């Protein structure tokens, strides 16, 4: 329970399925891109059967009429998603199914609604808006559906300012649904750190949910509840985005090519694929553990075959092996993928981490103070044996470590260190509110001390949100840097204390741990971070350039 996926499912099931569920009969469900991702997120597509769904189809693709079954339209308020519906009841007026049951993932504009109401049913026995416009990526991490948000959020200043406002409200209203699903009416507090986007957004959200609840028909929540929403801009921590993190999940999506949470084989023959989801429950116990601790907590070997191979429990060991043929089949996948990472590690990543941690901390490796840090960066130049990706990442740390660098010295690097093309992977970081040419700036923030224990002496770096999460739970947080019988009562449960965090421009898998580790160390409240997307070092760099060019 509580797992973000569950909460969403618990809502969809009672808001949608139960709402149009007739015990004796089943119906056809239609989904667009988003809703498909939404459902795939929090349920096996078989669980639907118990909910009154016998057939699911793509509302986009033309379909065969079934004028005997009722139709459940679970879609977003998208022009495309709605046009397709109107192509089932509106145009040609040639009805496709007995009746229609429309459930919009979010509020539906009058423009589209008008086109719906007018034409032409009748058949439309229901048009309901449930307000779920986010993806329960993990049981504590969410991600919105705001295409090309990052770009338009940190674009130079061309005609890409009208579309930036578009992305802003999209994020705002999309974030609001996150609250509404948790049944929380938080207090919006931004950061006064880089740029000022988080403040503008914090205003859109604060206003957005002031209108929401003022109209919410669920009637559960009205007036602020015991939870606070933090909106922070990406500039606040450029470091953690670039670090070659060592915790399993953050290192896999970084090193290996794991597009769409699906890591591809071998092994073996032929090459299949595996999915890194929470239904695995094995990868859930490992995705946040350090690479070494990972291996030494499930690997070699429970062998030779446990206590096999006088046999009183002979049949027991015969049946116990039949079902255990899957526990090993899964332990293998989460081991091969672990190998593919272990390799890239011993090959050069290991050496790359040595001088990265000492630079990101600038005083790590016991070397207090350090002084000349450009001496620390050197190693990663002849150890290449490297990719221009790792090279830029290392330099980025150096600059972040010495804040605003010089204009001339920076130039020499982009020359006598190759990195000719893809040079903007360093330049454009200034658009995110991080000094690139002007020395100093805000002279850096102030983070927590200890620095207690830190095995491996490589991942001694802690993302700045963890010091923010605790700075929120422990209450101690700068108010200037983080603005804003009878009786009656207004009961009551359940939700309780929740810390909702939302970083703009994406979150790292290393920052995701922070949510778990902090909420796991605590219990009096659950931290919940999110964004428009999840970040990987490379994908970030790619996105971080291209900024100075209006697409095209």
């Amino acid at each position: 329970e509580r797992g973000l996926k569950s909460v969403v499912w618990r809502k969809i099931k009672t808001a949608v399925f139960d709402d149009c569920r007739k015990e004796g009969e089943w119906k056809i469900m239609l989904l667009d891109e988003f809703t498909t991702k939404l459902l795939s997120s929090c349920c096996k597509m078989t669980d639907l059967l118990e909910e009154g769904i016998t057939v699911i189809e793509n509302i986009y693709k033309n379909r065969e009429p079934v004028r005997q079954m009722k139709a459940l339209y679970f879609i977003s308020p998208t022009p495309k998603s709605v046009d397709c519906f109107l192509r089932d009841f509106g145009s040609k007026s040639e009805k496709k199914y007995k009746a229609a049951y429309i459930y919009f993932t979010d509020f539906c504009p009058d423009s589209l609604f008008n086109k719906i109401k007018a034409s032409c049913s009748k058949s439309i026995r229901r048009c309901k808006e449930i307000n779920i416009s986010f993806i329960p990526q993990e049981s504590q991490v969410y991600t919105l559906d705001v295409p090309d948000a990052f770009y338009y959020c940190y674009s130079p200043d061309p005609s890409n300012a009208s579309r930036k406002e578009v992305v802003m409200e999209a994020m705002a209203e999309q974030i609001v649904t996150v609250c509404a699903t948790l049944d929380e009416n938080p207090g919006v507090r931004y950061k006064s750190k880089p740029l000022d986007n988080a403040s503008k957004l914090a205003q859109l959200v604060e206003k957005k949910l002031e209108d929401y609840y003022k109209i919410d028909e669920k009637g559960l929540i009205k007036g602020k509840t015991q939870s606070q929403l933090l909106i922070i801009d990406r500039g606040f921590d450029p470091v953690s985005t670039v670090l070659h993190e060592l915790t399993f999940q953050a290192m896999a999506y970084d090193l290996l090519p794991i597009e769409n949470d699906t890591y591809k084989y071998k092994t073996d023959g032929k090459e299949k694929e595996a999915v890194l989801e929470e239904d695995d429950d094995l990868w859930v116990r490992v995705r946040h553990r350090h690479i070494a601790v990972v291996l030494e907590e499930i690997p070699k070997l429970m062998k030779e075959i446990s206590s096999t191979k006088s046999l009183s429990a002979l049949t027991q060991l015969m049946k116990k092996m039949p079902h255990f043929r899957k526990q090993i089949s899964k332990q293998v996948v989460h081991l091969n993928l672990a190998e593919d990472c272990m390799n890239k590690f011993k090959l050069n990543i290991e050496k790359l981490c040595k001088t990265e941690q000492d630079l990101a901390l600038g005083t790590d490796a016991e070397g207090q103070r350090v002084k000349d840090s450009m001496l620390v960066l050197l190693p990663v130049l002849l150890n290449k044996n490297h990719d221009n990706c790792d090279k830029i990442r290392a330099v980025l740390l150096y600059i972040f470590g010495i804040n605003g660098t010089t204009e001339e010295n920076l130039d020499r690097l982009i020359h006598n260190v190759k990195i000719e093309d893809d040079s903007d992977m360093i330049r454009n970081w200034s658009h995110l509110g991080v000094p690139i040419v002007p020395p100093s700036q805000q002279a850096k923030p102030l983070r927590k001390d200890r620095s207690a224990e830190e095995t491996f002496q490589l991942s001694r770096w802690t993302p700045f949100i963890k010091d923010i999460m605790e700075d929120a739970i422990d209450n101690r947080l700068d108010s200037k840097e983080w603005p804003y019988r009878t009786n009656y009562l207004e009961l009551d449960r359940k939700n309780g204390s929740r810390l909702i965090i939302f970083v703009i421009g994406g979150i790292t898998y290393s920052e995701m741990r922070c949510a778990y580790e902090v909420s796991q160390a605590h219990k009096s409240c659950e931290v919940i971070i999110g964004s428009t997307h999840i970040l990987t070092p490379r994908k970030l760099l790619d996105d971080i350039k291209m900024l100075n060019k209006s697409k095209d």
Partner: peptide, 9 residues
């Protein structure tokens, strides 16, 4: 609004 069914008719 959250339930527009009535609004259709």
């Amino acid at each position: 609004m959250r339930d527009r069914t009535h609004e259709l008719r």
